[PDB]
Amino acid sequence: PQYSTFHSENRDWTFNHLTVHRRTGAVYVGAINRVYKLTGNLTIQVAHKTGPEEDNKACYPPLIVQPCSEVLTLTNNVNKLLIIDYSENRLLACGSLYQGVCKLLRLDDLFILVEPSHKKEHYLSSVNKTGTMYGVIVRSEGEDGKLFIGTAVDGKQDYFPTLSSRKLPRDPESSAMLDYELHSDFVSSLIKIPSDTLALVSHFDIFYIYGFASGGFVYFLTVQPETPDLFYTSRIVRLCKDDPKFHSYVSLPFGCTRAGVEYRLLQAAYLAKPGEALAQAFNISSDEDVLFAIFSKGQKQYHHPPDDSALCAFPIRAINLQIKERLQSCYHGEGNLELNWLLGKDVQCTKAPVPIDDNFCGLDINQPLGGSTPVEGLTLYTTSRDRLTSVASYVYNGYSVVFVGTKSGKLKKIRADGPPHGGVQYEMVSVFKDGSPILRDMAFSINQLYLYVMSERQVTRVPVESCEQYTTCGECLSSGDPHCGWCALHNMCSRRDKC
Ligand SMILES: *[C@@H]1O[C@H](CO)[C@@H](O[C@@H]2O[C@H](CO)[C@@H](O[C@@H]3O[C@H](CO[C@H]4O[C@H](CO[C@H]5O[C@H](CO)[C@@H](O)[C@H](O)[C@@H]5O)[C@@H](O)[C@H](O[C@H]5O[C@H](CO)[C@@H](O)[C@H](O)[C@@H]5O)[C@@H]4O)[C@@H](O)[C@H](O[C@H]4O[C@H](CO)[C@@H](O)[C@H](O)[C@@H]4O)[C@@H]3O)[C@H](O)[C@H]2NC(C)=O)[C@H](O)[C@H]1NC(C)=O
Ligand SMILES: *[C@@H]1O[C@H](CO)[C@@H](O[C@@H]2O[C@H](CO)[C@@H](O)[C@H](O)[C@H]2NC(C)=O)[C@H](O)[C@H]1NC(C)=O
Ligand SMILES: *[C@@H]1O[C@H](CO)[C@@H](O)[C@H](O)[C@H]1NC(C)=O
């Protein structure tokens, strides 16, 4: 079949991130040294150089803010982040160069709208490997709005915070760009990895894999080595949208297990609406959000992972409630804070007469809050033949179809039914005809019809339905591909709306 494609114009200039404009269908593909804007049918429009440029990783503060007495080199710019900012009609993009430059581009032509100041803190991270940084832009009505950002900091606990909320202001001209939402001597909208922890655990860092806006909160999904073989722990991090002091912080481990085997290494995630099936399963409305995630076996070697992988669903209501009860108890003197990487010691929960209302936003006591009581997600599908890499979901006609990418370059189409079944992988499709890993990022067309899927050197527009393959009614209504109805006055298997 003749799928739409976009190859990398270069052997070195590989793809990093991807996103689609949900109203115009422009395909923005962040890549090494480039940030291409494409059209719906993946035909090249605006190429955009971001690299390479002269730089050196040892230079801090970065070359942009001062000359540095080091041997410079022609260093590459890896696209670490790529969020469309819908409210202010602009793209945001960050890179590995000059200690983590963020540039606000323009949607129309990718022309640099705003350079951030030459204040060294406006630069985010010297880390030049992908899938360690994620951001969420939150512009709830009334204020200028902000960027919540988390990133790996490669041992420089002084230079870059692990997670912070920056100002992303209305006036594109403004110098306020990427200043901390708050910055006094002590209280600030940033969390820094203490030196104590970086000593006590060798190459200690926190990789951020996904983040999302949900209701009154911002959530970040983080993988890290664990305080005393190599023990890794995937987590959920939750902050109030309106909290500058960062007092609202609370962090719980998460994972899912099926058939005695347990999966606790987050490889991907993706927020979406719940199935009809899945909605009944979690006792949520068909409004509320469900986070779909992928996990590896155990908690061993995140850097060299196995093959046993598992898709699972977490309804936000469960997270929001498992947190609510964690806070609850801790506010009645029960247990400890239990967050040893950031606290560096044991801190006893303070019993306080404070009601933990449905959306409570922290005080200066019992924070930051942790926990050692995993948030268990409902498994939907497993395998050990192929490793799973990416995840993306949506709801067609009550049925939640979930798409999953593989190490071998395959996209599975799983329909989620919930207990006791879980999910039925109704169809597989080989996207990359050589067996190239699919990358964490995947997104739909404006009107659901396609899903953009990408490897290091490829981007392909794969359609959701291909019911054509099903020739007879006995094969059509047999596969369980929720799109496919058998057609009357046509005598073929296709989608509902075109019949
Ligand atoms: C989503 O939410 C729903 C709704 O909240 C939830 O379903 C409830 O689950 C809870 C907790 O598991 C159940 O509570 C248990 O109830 C036990 C007794 O239940 C019987 O009695 C119910 C009331 O009967 C009265 O009203 C009916 C009118 O319908 C009338 O005819 C009767 O004569 C009587 O007056 C009755 O509704 C219920 O019957 C339904 O449910 C059964 C399945 O259980 C189903 O097969 C039937 O078809 C029917 O729809 C049933 O006959 C009770 O003994 C038990 O108490 C123990 O545990 C608690 C908590 O640990 C202790 O406090 C207690 O001391 C005992 O140890 C428990 O409270 C509740 O029955 C369910 N409600 C319904 C409507 O089904 C789902 O779980 C949620 N879904 C998911 C996926 O999570
Ligand atoms: C990320 O930066 C590192 C530098 O720290 C790069 O690794 C270097 O690669 C060159 C060859 O291109 C070698 O000569 C050096 O020995 C490497 N240095 C170190 C410290 O390992 C790496 O290539 C960069 N990655 C990307 C994707 O650009
Ligand atoms: C894709 O469609 C566009 C119109 O948006 C057209 O200009 C372009 O030529 C098409 N590309 C290919 C590769 O056929």
From Swiss-Prot:
Keywords per UniProt: Cell membrane, Coiled coil, Disulfide bond, Glycoprotein, Membrane, Phosphoprotein, Repeat, Signal, Transmembrane, Transmembrane helix
Effect noted on mutating residue 352 to E: Abolishes interaction with SEMA6A
Location (main, coarse): membrane
Domain Sema: 1-464
Cellular compartments annotated: Cell membrane
GO terms, molecular function: identical protein binding; semaphorin receptor activity
Glycosylation sites: 41, 128, 283
SS bond partners: 59-68, 94-102, 240-361, 256-312, 330-349, 467-484, 476-493, 487-499
Subunit and partners: Homodimer. Interacts with RND1. Interacts directly with NRP1 and NRP2. The PLXNA2 homodimer interacts with a SEMA6A homodimer, giving rise to a heterotetramer.
Protein name as catalogued: Plexin-A2
Organism: Mus musculus (Mouse)
